[PDB]
Enzyme design. Structure first.
Site, PDB file in Angstrom:
ATOM      1  NE  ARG A 136      -3.666   0.624   8.422  1.00  0.00           N
ATOM      2  CZ  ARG A 136      -3.978   0.820   7.063  1.00  0.00           C
ATOM      3  NH1 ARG A 136      -2.986   1.784   6.061  1.00  0.00           N
ATOM      4  NH2 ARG A 136      -4.834   0.586   6.625  1.00  0.00           N
TER       5      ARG A 136
ATOM      6  NE  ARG B 182       1.297   6.454   4.502  1.00  0.00           N
ATOM      7  CZ  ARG B 182       1.727   5.410   3.825  1.00  0.00           C
ATOM      8  NH1 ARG B 182       1.074   4.278   4.402  1.00  0.00           N
ATOM      9  NH2 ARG B 182       2.169   5.392   2.461  1.00  0.00           N
TER      10      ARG B 182
ATOM     11  CD  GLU C  62      -3.878   4.697  -0.852  1.00  0.00           C
ATOM     12  OE1 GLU C  62      -3.000   4.703  -0.491  1.00  0.00           O
ATOM     13  OE2 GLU C  62      -5.116   4.548  -0.395  1.00  0.00           O
TER      14      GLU C  62
ATOM     15  CB  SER D 274      -6.215   0.910  -2.010  1.00  0.00           C
ATOM     16  OG  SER D 274      -5.291  -0.021  -2.727  1.00  0.00           O
TER      17      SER D 274
ATOM     18  NE  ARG E 253      -5.871   8.171   3.810  1.00  0.00           N
ATOM     19  CZ  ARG E 253      -5.775   6.806   3.749  1.00  0.00           C
ATOM     20  NH1 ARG E 253      -5.794   6.454   2.595  1.00  0.00           N
ATOM     21  NH2 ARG E 253      -5.855   5.862   4.728  1.00  0.00           N
TER      22      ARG E 253
END
Lengths: 413, 413
Positions: free
Chosen positions: A260, A266, A338, A341, A380
């Site tokens: 990304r 991140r 988080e 998801s 993570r």
């Protein structure tokens, strides 16, 4: 994309549901394009009828021995007028298509209405955060003191927001991904896949990343892009396919890096174990509960406290109609962050891909539903393990389920 | 790149050694640039001396009360003439640099002289090819009949010369990479690393991929390129570093995908377990024997027949000064095919990276040596296992060492 009949028959009901997400559906601009399209359509049909009528007159003039050049000129003039109208029509239909591809998915009625993350709802929580009798160290410090984390090297090799991991820290990162893949393939019925990390334009349009999120992707100058998530290649395996209803559900998993370009910072490159399900339309809400549970099992087997939240309309992603987020306890920040998801995408992606299922009860086909979730984001998960299993001397206890994957190691350092 | 003193002191001996590789060293063009460089150097020094001399005269004219504008004009004219000479010099030094970066490494004297692969020498072979009492099936057919190989899906997702693997075939691909990483980290003393799969320009210049092989790389529009091999990020970890001689050798390994835009058909994306060693100059020929043996151990533990060949001067890669290739037996083709390549790079890369070692016996520093090899290319190892362990009914026996990595499976299918 959304059902085109829904947009034509009840544009105002659709605009209402999209407003809950904070998306303004320009019903006036769309309706104007639809009207201009119908006018151009009639125009080309009228010109076609004129052309065929003038052809009959040319034939009669030939039989009489008259000069047909004045008639031939008008028929050629008409053929150019008809080509100009067809060009205008195809440009107008492409403009309607462009707009329709930027419309997010309709949220499910049960999804809480809200504007942002502050309106998300906590629906459950598992485990109790460990009480520490020493000062809690963060994952970066822990990684550096075990010589397994080098951000400076990553900047030298590449740039900022990349990471280099070494030694036992890299081995635990690897062990986590193997544990996850084994769990989902041996226990949860997912089929393993090795997929390309570069994909073409059609694959990105299929799952919804294009056109709206071109700027979030790395593109390679053979017009490819690096995958932002394994959802993109996995879901497109059924692109253009008609699947027999008895073959469903198709459950696929993969361990890939994700790229990304753009609490826990991140990275541009990070690892994920992705879960994807292709299911019958009437089974997708059940599949979402199943898939979320698969992600929860990973957290439970690793003994990490977490909470489950249902995202409100204003915080959901482009393609989701319903989403559960799992947030893991991060000791050094004294809050949850988080880590997973899971989304039900309804027929949004299936419609772009033309992935349909055939019933055989009446051999009629309809769009499948697609679901995706991470189980889990590996990097993570590593941060959570490192912080929740740290000891007073800086060592890190290796969770029980990872020991077989780390040559029996019990502690790091 | 090569030692610049070697090119200046004995250009003809260097041109002789490079001719063995089939590389024409343009000694005349280089010597002309070196001469023009020295002339420009003297020119700027002469102009500098004139400028300082005219400054003294301006000071005298000031003290006498004379007009200094005619003198001030000439000194400004000189400062522009000096800037023009410095611009020409910096352009000329960059042109010399460009040429020097395209010169391949000098081969070691012991390397057989030859023009192409037909002059490579077989130095040993291990194992006996299995005798089959049935007709031998190729790996593609075997992969398709176990529903674990889908080239058509890869074309749909991406394009040609990509592969999708599924089910037990993907699991064996994964098991191979874990077995290799565990072997090299637990038994052979390599340290594990998670590295970026995107790197910047300096990293590619450091290991030699740039400038000559820009066309073999995928570039991403943040001016990055996908790694063609883990050699690139791993070796650059010591870029610009001075290492204490007692810290050597540094032994690093990684499992990464490799990307190349461009018997066994080569893919654009394939997996490799890479071995990299940073060593003292006098230990690199020994390190190459050690590293090649590590790759051989993988083949031996998997029970695959192979042969070791030493590449001749004309078949070696750009940066190598000596290379061993391992070729594994491919039943369906009744011949051996490359599966591993181990090279001693001498100080070629170290010189571009300025990776030096300090002795402490006299605190003087010198360039390290670098070595790299694959142990092994995972996808190619998979092809060898599939074909050499096939049974008459199409099933594939899982080699003994992979069984712990495949949940005890003994057969595929």
């Amino acid at each position: 994309m959304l059902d085109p009949n829904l947009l034509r028959n009840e544009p105002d009901a659709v605009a209402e549901k999209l407003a809950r997400r904070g998306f303004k559906l320009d019903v006036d601009k769309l309706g104007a394009l639809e009207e201009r399209r119908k006018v151009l359509q009639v125009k080309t049909e009228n010109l076609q009828a004129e052309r065929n009528s003038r052809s009959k007159s040319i034939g009669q003039a030939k039989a009489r021995g008259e000069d047909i050049e004045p008639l031939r000129l008008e028929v050629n003039k008409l053929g150019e007028e008809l080509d100009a109208a067809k060009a205008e029509l195809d440009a107008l239909q492409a403009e309607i298509r462009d707009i329709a591809l930027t419309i997010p998915n309709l949220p499910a009625d049960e999804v809480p209405v809200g504007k942002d993350e502050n309106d998300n709802v906590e629906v459950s929580r598992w485990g109790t955060p460990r009480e520490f009798d020493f000062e809690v160290r963060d994952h970066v410090t822990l990684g550096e003191m075990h010589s397994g984390l080098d951000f400076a090297a990553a900047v030298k090799l590449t740039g900022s927001r990349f990471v280099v991991m070494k030694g036992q820290i890299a081995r635990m990162h690897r062990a986590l991904s193997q544990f996850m893949l084994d769990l989902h393939t041996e226990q949860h019925g997912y089929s393993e896949n090795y997929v390309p990390y570069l994909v073409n334009q059609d694959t990105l349009y299929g799952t919804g990343q294009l056109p709206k999120f071109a700027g979030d992707l790395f593109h390679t100058r053979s017009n490819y892009a690096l995958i932002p998530t394994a959802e993109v290649p996995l879901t497109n395996l059924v692109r253009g396919e008609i699947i027999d209803e008895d073959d469903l559900p198709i459950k696929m998993t993969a361990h890939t890096p994700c790229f990304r370009s753009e609490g826990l910072i991140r990275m541009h490159q990070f690892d994920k174990v992705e879960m994807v399900q292709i299911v019958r339309p009437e089974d997708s809400m059940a599949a979402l509960e199943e898939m979320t549970g698969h992600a929860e099992k990973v957290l439970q087997l690793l003994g990490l406290p977490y909470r489950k939240i249902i995202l409100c309309t204003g915080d959901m992603g482009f393609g989701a109609c319903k989403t559960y987020d799992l947030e893991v306890w991060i000791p050094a920040q004294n809050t949850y962050r988080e880590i997973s998801s899971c989304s039900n995408v309804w027929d949004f992606q299936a419609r772009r891909m033309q992935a349909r299922c055939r019933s055989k009860s009446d051999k009629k086909t309809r769009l499948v539903h697609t679901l995706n979730g991470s189980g889990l984001a590996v990097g993570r998960t590593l941060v959570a393990v490192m912080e929740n299993y740290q000891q007073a001397d800086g060592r890190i206890e290796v969770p029980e389920v990872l020991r077989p994957y780390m040559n029996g190691l019990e502690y790091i350092g």
